[PDB]
Design a protein around this ligand. Structure first.
Ligand SMILES: Nc1[nH]c(=O)nc2c1ncn2[C@H]1C[C@H](O)[C@@H](COP(=O)(O)OP(=O)(O)OP(=O)(O)O)O1
Ligand code: NA
Ligand code: NA
Length: 156
């Protein structure tokens, strides 16, 4: 069995658009993603997701709703990424560009799947339908899925 590290991912999803962030620097630059990062000691997962949304995008929110959980496994990495996925309830403020991330709105008929993590093509349609999900994806590198599971659930 493997150890897992906790991460968050937040989708700012409105009726006609979604906010994504383009990673600007380092390895993995050029891909659009939700907002999030590692959970820290002592905070709840939801509070970590709110904190990461603010640090990464400048947006604050009073509350999130949990919509999914996805485990990522990468060839050559023994540690699993356990990603807890949330959708915003309502947002305050404007998103802000940083040196690491550029936020941008996309209409929901222009979701930029080819420039997102490949797994998003599978689970983000469920998120758009207001369904909840559990997933697992094993990657070779950044682009190639070797194995995956995806299941709609009634409780995350
Ligand atoms: N396959 C994938 N599909 C996806 O949609 N999001 C993914 C993904 N793999 C990783 N992510 C997201 C999860 C999380 O929001 C982020 C990874 O977190 P990071 O390692 O950037 O966290 P931190 O910024 O806290 O890390 P530090 O560099 O230690 O500060 O990318
Ligand atoms: Na962090
Ligand atoms: Na991050």
């Amino acid at each position: 069995m493997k150890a897992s590290r906790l991460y968050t991912l937040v989708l700012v999803l409105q009726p006609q658009r979604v906010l994504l962030g383009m990673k600007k620097r380092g390895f993995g630059a050029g891909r659009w993603n939700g907002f999030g990062g590692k959970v820290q000691e002592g905070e709840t997962i939801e509070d970590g997701a709110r904190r990461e949304l603010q640090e990464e995008s400048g947006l604050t929110v009073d509350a999130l709703h949990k919509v999914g959980q996805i485990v990522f496994e990468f060839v050559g990495e023994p540690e699993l990424m356990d990603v807890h996925v949330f959708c915003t309830d309502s947002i305050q403020g404007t998103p802000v560009e940083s040196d690491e991330m550029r936020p941008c709105w996309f209409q929901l008929d222009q979701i930029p799947f080819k420039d997102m993590w490949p797994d998003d093509s599978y689970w983000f349609p469920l998120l758009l339908q207001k369904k909840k999900f559990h997933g697992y994806f094993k990657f070779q590198g950044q682009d190639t899925i070797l194995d995956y599971t995806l299941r709609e659930v009634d409780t995350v």
